[PDB]
RNA sequence: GACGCGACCGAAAUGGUGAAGGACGGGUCCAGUGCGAAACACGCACUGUUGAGUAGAGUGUGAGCUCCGUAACUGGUCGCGUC
């Protein structure tokens, strides 16, 4: 019954502003203290911010302090951080946690959100390319082909891919996302097929991503010789 | 000072119906204010345990807490199927709040080679001017592997960048994708693209190579 | 010995006075632990080994005690009066 759910994530430019929202529903944060975490992809955990009850006392980890402020609506019964001269560093999921009642479970953060994703960054939202990896023209290594998508050159963050509307799913690997040189991000998706069903059967990979309104499907063949 | 919580080790390999032991380590005294959480890929945290040795509630008792001065050790008796995964530690003695770095779970298995598979780039990516050769490893353990990029047999590299998925939940293996990146006018000054792949599980080096512009 | 008067002593009490710091306490101060939906701030409880400046980091006509007084008395002693 207790939730917490953030929302206020999204692009912003270096040195930009943003405000997260906390939205809490099963309890009432005025009896409890919030903190705010953040990971950035790939990595750990990071402590960044908390409010304490009845006080207001606020506490800010070194690398934000300055920066960023958390505050508490109780009328809403929601908590923010507002996120001033945002930096790249900064790029991260940020979860709302709340820290239980201290007879139950001490100072443990017993109920967190599932985050929403903040991309700090100079450039500017743009659609995927979907290239085909087609299976190889010899036989295969195995006993299966492999053939996939290359979704490149896409920003910011995140992209769906699915293999025949969602019906394939055994033997799909699809990649986390690497971030270019260029700023954009890429990834492929890839599935392993028999080898002799490759020219009777149908192997689509659908691409979503939202940011930019771009929704692709491309139908994945062997080529020529 | 802020306080330091050192988490060791970084990842472990284990079997279901292991033992096994997570270590974190303060940088000065944190009484018994430190929780462990758990987190899968994709999802927010969840509490294990309290004030150093308090088991949350609802958490299964084969998850223990311990305290030895200022070194605090999260202990699963029997490893289940369900708990694979990361474990942090953190402290709440002072603020800054402090989170230890991470221990990865992973399970243990028999050493399986890849599957190499290698793509040359669509025509429809040379038309822009960019050329992105792939190579896939498939399905094997250990995650540890090596790829090797060769341009009409020069070894490539700061070309490429390599991602890897999650271990699988059905047979435990990894998957491993790295991408060359040229430019067009580049990608047409040479003939053979090869990936070449060394693995533990893999008796010699494997090359798979394509001819620019053969079928 | 009784009655009576006085002085001296004692004296419950009391006005003023000024030293003592955690072994007089505290609604003094500091710290720690637990509790209050509560890490700080606020409140309660508890534990503190130079906890800790003796009259103030105090806004106690605080207790006790020192020193100078005063003192109920239905206490003692001595003198004197009457028998
Ligand atoms: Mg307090």
């Known amino acids: 019954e207790v939730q917490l759910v953030e929302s206020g994530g999204g692009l912003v430019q270096p040195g930009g502003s943003l405000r997260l929202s906390c939205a809490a529903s099963?309890?009432?944060?005025?009896?409890?203290?919030i903190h705010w975490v953040r990971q950035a992809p790939g990595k750990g955990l990071e402590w960044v911010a908390s409010?304490?009850?009845?006080?207001?006392?606020?506490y800010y980890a070194d690398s934000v302090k300055g920066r960023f402020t958390i505050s508490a609506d109780t009328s809403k019964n929601t908590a923010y951080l507002q996120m001033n001269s945002l930096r790249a560093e900064d790029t991260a999921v940020y979860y709302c946690?709340?820290?239980?009642?201290?007879?139950?479970?001490?100072?443990?953060?017993?109920?967190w959100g599932q985050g929403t994703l903040v991309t700090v960054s100079s450039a500017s939202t743009k659609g995927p390319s979907v290239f085909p990896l087609a299976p190889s023209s010899k036989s295969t290594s195995g006993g299966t082909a492999a053939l996939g998508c290359l979704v490149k050159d896409y920003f910011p963050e995140p992209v769906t891919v699915s293999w025949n509307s969602g019906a394939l799913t055994s033997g799909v690997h699809t990649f986390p996302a690497v971030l270019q040189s260029s700023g954009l991000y890429s990834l492929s998706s890839v599935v392993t097929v028999p080898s002799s069903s490759l020219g009777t059967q149908t192997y689509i990979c659908n691409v979503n991503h939202k940011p930019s309104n771009t929704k692709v499907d491309k139908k994945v063949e062997p080529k020529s010789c | 000072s802020d306080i330091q919580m050192t988490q060791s080790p970084s990842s472990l390999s284990a079997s279901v119906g292991d033992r096994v032991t997570i270590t974190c380590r303060a940088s000065?005294?944190?009484?018994?204010?430190v929780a462990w959480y758990q987190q899968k890929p994709g999802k927010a945290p969840k509490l294990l345990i309290y004030?150093?040795?308090s088991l949350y509630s609802g958490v299964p008792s084969r998850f223990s807490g311990s305290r030895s001065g200022t070194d605090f050790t999260l202990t699963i008796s029997s490893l289940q199927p369900e708990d694979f995964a990361t474990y942090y530690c953190?402290?709440?003695?002072?603020?800054?709040?402090?989170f230890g770095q991470g221990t990865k779970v992973e399970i243990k298995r028999t050493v399986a080679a890849p599957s190499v598979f290698i793509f040359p780039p669509s025509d429809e990516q040379l038309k822009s001017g960019t050329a992105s050769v792939v190579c896939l490893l498939n399905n094997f353990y250990p995650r540890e592997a090596k790829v090797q990029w060769k341009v009409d047999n020069a070894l490539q590299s700061g070309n490429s960048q390599e991602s890897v998925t999650e271990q699988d939940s059905k047979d435990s293996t990894y998957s491993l994708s790295s991408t060359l990146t040229l430019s067009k006018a580049d990608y047409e000054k040479h003939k053979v693209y090869a990936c070449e792949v060394t693995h533990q599980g893999l008796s010699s080096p494997v090359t798979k190579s394509f001819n620019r512009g053969e079928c």
């Open positions: 409010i304490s009850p009845y006080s207001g006392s606020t």
């Open positions: 004030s150093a040795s």
């Open positions: 099963g309890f009432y944060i005025s009896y409890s203290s």
């Open positions: 946690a709340r820290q239980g009642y201290r007879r139950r479970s001490g100072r443990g953060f017993d109920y």
């Open positions: 953190q402290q709440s003695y002072s603020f800054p709040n402090t």
């Open positions: 000065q005294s944190v009484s018994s204010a």
